[PDB]
Amino acid sequence: HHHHHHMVHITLDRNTANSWLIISKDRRQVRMGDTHQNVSDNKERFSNYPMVLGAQRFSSGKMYWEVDVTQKEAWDLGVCRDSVQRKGQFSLSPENGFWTIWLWQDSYEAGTSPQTTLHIQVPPCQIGIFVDYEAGVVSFYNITDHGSLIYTFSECVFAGPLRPFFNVGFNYSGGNAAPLKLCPL
Ligand SMILES: O=C1CN(Cc2ccccc2)CC(=O)N1
Numbered sequence: 001h002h003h004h005h006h007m008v009h010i011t012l013d014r015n016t017a018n019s020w021l022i023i024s025k026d027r028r029q030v031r032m033g034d035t036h037q038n039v040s041d042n043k044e045r046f047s048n049y050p051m052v053l054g055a056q057r058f059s060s061g062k063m064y065w066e067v068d069v070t071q072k073e074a075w076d077l078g079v080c081r082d083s084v085q086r087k088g089q090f091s092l093s094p095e096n097g098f099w100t101i102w103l104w105q106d107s108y109e110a111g112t113s114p115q116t117t118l119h120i121q122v123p124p125c126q127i128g129i130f131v132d133y134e135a136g137v138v139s140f141y142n143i144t145d146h147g148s149l150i151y152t153f154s155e156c157v158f159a160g161p162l163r164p165f166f167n168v169g170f171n172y173s174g175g176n177a178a179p180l181k182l183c184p185l
Helices: none
Strands: 021-024 029-032 051-053 062-068 075-081 098-104 109-111 126-132 137-142 147-153 162-167 180-182
Touching: 075 126, 075 137, 098 147, 098 162, 109 147
Parallel strands: none
Antiparallel strands: 021 029, 029 180, 051 162, 062 126, 062 180, 075 098, 075 162, 098 109, 126 137, 137 147
């Protein structure tokens, strides 16, 4: 791909984070904490899952960023509407305002409803995410495999401002403690 020149500097929004997440000082890394991280509750925080939003809101244009997923067993990545549900149980789907892919139990899937199997020969250590607002496109790229395409959501109905979306996943196994990191431009 040749989307690198639309690179944007993403930072994480503390206020949206599940209360167990630890966001680095530079707001570029996030990981699962051992316990509750001693923050007050608020209506923005994702309550049920280890999720956080980027601070940036996009309503036009083309945007690109990259995320490091090295040594994780489980995670979700993509974009979502600013108005997505924060509290309780929900599925990641375009009907609920999410355009995402994930790793879970040694398989990669796109967050369609129902979910779509992805075909990845080279497990990625870094993921590229491209959003074309006007075109209604969200695409995912395997940076470890020379930028190969993972998945394209087309005919997207964003229906609002978009925010970068992250889920570090649970760490029931003791093998998923590693952070998500926003990679430098
Ligand atoms: O990885 C974990 C975290 N988990 C707490 C938790 C629940 C809901 C949302 C965020 C955090 C408990 C557990 O058993 N392991």
